[PDB]
């Protein structure tokens, strides 16, 4: 299958994201300094294991080189002080782009203030996320930082149908669309995450990704990790049950033409990369029938066999 | 996914197979007495550990009850003596349908000859397979047995592309094709397996399954286990890398609307059931969008969470 709209392929400090199915490998986004991460001893001050963080980053580079799946780091923080330190460390200890990420918007806003309108921040920092309840101070913070790429969380807990993403992105009635809001903050590149409620509803998330790519061509992806970790029945079964079950959830959106996955904790990268790379290789082999051409030689199809 | 043709749903001794995606759970087909299966002490005579074989069968029943994925047993033999004894054991020690399976047509034919005319054989035994080298003797033997269900195997290194596998199935030029051959043997129910050449080309297998369901409405599935076991680079990595990779391969045809998977050795059932059930739950959650109704309450979506 192929999408009608010409697909946006963004180049985020070397990382290609988007395209027609089989054109580009899945971009894999691993979480670090998340709530309960054992390498963080104090989430308020940002006291973290630099050796263990470096080792996770080096492992991501090695898996990325093995499969050809590019990586963006999901950097989480619970305070301005902590997320600022986390971001400074990520900037120095990898070349990867990264998500500035937090549960609390005020943590993202505060961290942007500290980081300033640094040209490296504009090239490597992706705002996570512009959500339905965005504030003017949030858009001002993004604009002062001079950011160019954001995750658009195209999720409304009152608008669960895939077709409603057209309304959320474009706007409807008196409501400014999320794309219009991002553009006001100076954002030019939109990674669309339609949101995941639970594991089963990942099928609606992936259908929403298809609508967005079909009609607008923005790269589409999602973040099923929270839904997988709340599946206590699977998680307590141990190896390899939790891993294959996770693999089934994380690969599913890719089988329907999604462009990126937030796969959760980076410690799971070794099995996530191998499953995702397997799905990419099979999708790209289908190119041979569709005439769709790979946009890079760094593709799992040419690497993992 | 929703398929053009009206789908054929077979009821094989209580096991539902086929339909629109999300209508019925994936049927999982585990292999027993395969080459090198260590519970077999003599593969020529069919001497095996009956308690160990019973333990695999009981485990399949337990996993099936957990997820709601029905099971058919893939019963392999390398001799008429062995496959006859294997079939007699499976008849008495499970209620499940099974594949009468051998690489050697002579072994399949010989074993079928031993089993005679038996309504239990006609209801439970699925011939594996009607394939490109079929003989009139083999069709006559199937007709004498009064079998009604067969695996139609389009695996041929003279039919690599999906549309060439459809030509093998429906017939072309001087060939009646595999479906026409099965019908002359009195087969009325066709489980179509386009074959797996290698891991990457599981997408071509899946494209062939899609054409079958689009045009004919016959249940479609495949047997990717050999291709996964021959993947030295991935298998070398061990647990859980081999399994998540295997799960990516086995779930992929299900994400594109396939009806059944031969997942290889029954010992792998514990992780195969957990991955496949996960994909099924996500597919069934789509049912409102596709306009599909579940045909049963025994569905992973209603059981595994």
Residue numbers in the entry:
A (entry chain A), B (entry chain B): 2 to 306
Show the paper's wording.
During energy production in Desulfitobacterium hafniense, MtgA catalyzes the methyl transfer from methylcobalamin (Cbl‐CH3) to THF in the catabolism of glycine betaine (GB). Despite its lack of sequence identity with known structures, we could show that MtgA forms a homodimeric complex of two TIM barrels. The topology of each subunit is characterized by a funnel of eight parallel β‐sheets connected by α‐helices on the outside that form a complex of two perpendicularly oriented TIM barrels. The active‐site cavity is located inside the hydrophilic core of each barrel.
